[PDB]
Amino acid sequence: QTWYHEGPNSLKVARLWIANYSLPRAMKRLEEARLHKEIPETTRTSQMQELHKSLRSLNNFCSQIGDDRPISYCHFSPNSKMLATACWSGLCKLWSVPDCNLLHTLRGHNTNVGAIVFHPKSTVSLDPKDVNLASCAADGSVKLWSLDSDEPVADIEGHTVRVARVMWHPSGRFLGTTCYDRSWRLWDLEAQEEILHQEGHSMGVYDIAFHQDGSLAGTGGLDAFGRVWDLRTGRCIMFLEGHLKEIYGINFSPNGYHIATGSGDNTCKVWDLRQRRCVYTIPAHQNLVTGVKFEPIHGNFLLTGAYDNTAKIWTHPGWSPLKTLAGHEGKVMGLDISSDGQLIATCSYDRTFKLWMAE
Amino acid sequence: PEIEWWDSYIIFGITNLVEHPAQLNPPGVYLTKKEQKKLRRQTRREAQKELQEKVRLGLMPPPEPKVISQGVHISVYRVRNLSNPAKKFKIEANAGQLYLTGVVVLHKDVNVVVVEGGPKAQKKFKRLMLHRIKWDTNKCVLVWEGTAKDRSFGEMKFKQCPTENMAREHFKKHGAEHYWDLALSESVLESTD
Amino acid sequence: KAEVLWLMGAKSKWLAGDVPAARSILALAFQANPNSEEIWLAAVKLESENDEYERARRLLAKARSSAPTARVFMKSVKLEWVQDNIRAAQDLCEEALRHYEDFPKLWMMKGQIEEQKEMMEKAREAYNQGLKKCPHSTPLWLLLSRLEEKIGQLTRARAILEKSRLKNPKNPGLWLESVRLEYRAGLKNIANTLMAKALQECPNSGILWSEAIFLEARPQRRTKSVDALKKCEHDPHVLLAVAKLFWSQRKITKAREWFHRTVKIDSDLGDAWAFFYKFELQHGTEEQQEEVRKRCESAEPRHGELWCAVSKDIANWQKKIGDILRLVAGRI
Amino acid sequence: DVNPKAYPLADAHLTKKLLDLVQQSCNYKQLRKGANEATKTLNRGISEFIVMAADAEPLEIILHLPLLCEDKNVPYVFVRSKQALGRACGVSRPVIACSVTIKEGSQLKQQIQSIQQSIERLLV
Angle at A54 between CA A52 and CA A60, to 5 degrees: 125
Between C156, C189, C190, which is nearest A61 by CB?
C156
Q: Do C159 and A68 touch (CB under 8 A)?
A: no
Q: Which helix (H) or strand (E) holds A256?
A: none
Chain B contacts of A223, Cβ < 8 Å?
Answer: 26
Region of D54 on the Ramachandran plot (φ > 0 left; ψ -120 to 50 alpha; else beta): alpha
Contact D87 B123 (CB under 8 A): no
Of the partner residues D7, D70, D124, the one whose CB lies closest to the CB of residue A288: D124
Under 8 Å between Cβ of A162 and A177: no
- Contacting residues of C for A357, CB less than 8 Å apart: none
D1-124 classified as CATH 3.10.100.10: no
Residue of A nearest to B73 (CA): A265
**Distances in Å between the alpha carbon of C168 and those of A319, A353, C172?**
30, 22, 11
First to last CA, chain A: 56
CB contact under 8 A, B147 and A196: no
In chain A, which residues have their Cβ closer than 8 Å to the Cβ of B177?
Answer: none
Domain ranges of chain D: 1-124
CB atoms near residue A170 (< 10 Å): 17
φ/ψ (deg, to 5) at C143: -60, -45
Q: Which chains touch B (3 or more CB pairs under 8 A)?
A: A, D
Q: Do C193 and D73 touch (CB under 8 A)?
A: yes
Question: Which of D13, B55, B18 minimizes the C-alpha distance to A230?
Answer: B18
Give dist(CA C264, CA D21) in Å, integer.
Answer: 47
Instruction: State whether residue B47 is helix, strand or coil.
Output: helix
Helix or strand or coil: residue A338? coil
Interface of D with B in 88-107 (CB under 8 A): 88
Mutate to test the interface with B, among D13, D14, D110, D113 (most CBs of B within 10 A): D110
Cβ contacts of C165 on chain A, cutoff 8 Å: 329
Cα C236 to Cα C254: distance, rounded to the nearest angstrom = 16
Task: Give chain C positions within 8 Å (CB) of D71.
Answer: 189, 192-193, 196
- D43: helix, strand or coil: helix
Neighbours of A162 (CB within 10 A): 22
What number of residues does chain C have?
Answer: 332
CA C6 to chain CA centroid, Å, is 28
All chains having 3 or more CB pairs closer than 8 angstroms to chain A:
B, C, D
Point out residues after which chain B has a gap (C–N over 2.5 Å): 11, 27, 67, 136
Distances (CA, A) of A276 to A189, A292, B5: 33, 20, 11
| Pick among A57, A65, A324, A332 to test the C interface (most C CBs inside 10 A) | A65
Contacts of D72 in chain C (CB under 8 A): 193, 196
**Interrupted after residues, chain C (C–N over 2.5 Å):** none
User: Do A82 and A103 contact (CB within 8 A), yes or no?
Assistant: yes
CA A145 to CA A88: how far, in whole Å? 18
Are D86 and D96 contacting, i.e. CB atoms less than 8 angstroms apart? no
H or E stretch covering A94: strand A92-96
Interface residue A264 vs chain D (CB under 8 A): yes
**Three-class secondary structure assignment of chain C:** CCCHHHHHHHHHHHHHCCHHHHHHHHHHHHHHCCCCCHHHHHHHHHHHHCCCHHHHHHHHHHHHHHCCCCHHHHHHHHHHHHCCCHHHHHHHHHHHHHHCCCCCHHHHHHHHHHHHCCCCHHHHHHHHHHHHHCCCCHHHHHHHHHHHHHHCCHHHHHHHHHHHHHHCCCCHHHHHHHHHHHHHCCCHHHHHHHHHHHHHHCCCCHHHHHHHHHHCCHHHHHHHHHHHHHHCCCCHHHHHHHHHHHHHCCCHHHHHHHHHHHHHHCCCEHHHHHHHHHHHHHCCCHHHHHHHHHHHHHCCCECCCCCCCCCCCCCCCCCCHHHHHHHHHCCC
CA dihedral A117, A121, A127, A128 (to 10 degrees): 20
DSSP assigned state of B129: I
Bridge partners of residue A59, in order along the sequence: A357
D39 vs C contacts (CB less than 8 Å): none
Residues of D in contact with A138 (CB under 8 A): 4, 7
The angle subtended at Cα A52 by Cα A51 and Cα A57, nearest 5°, is 95
Choose from A10, A183, A245 for mutation: most chain B CBs within 10 A: A245
User: Could you tell me whether strands A352-358 and B111-117 are parallel, antiparallel, or unpaired per DSSP bridges?
Assistant: unpaired
Method: cryo-EM
Residue of chain A whose Cα is closest to the Cα of C198: A329
Question: Resolution of the deposited coordinates, in angstroms?
Answer: 3.2
Q: What's the one-letter identity of residue A158?
A: G
Check D45 against C200: CB less than 8 A apart: yes
Quote the distance between the C-alpha of residue A293 and its chain's center. Answer: 7
B120 interfacial to chain D (CB closer than 8 Å): no
Q: Calculate the alpha carbon distances from A274 to A209, A300, D41 in Å.
A: 18, 18, 57
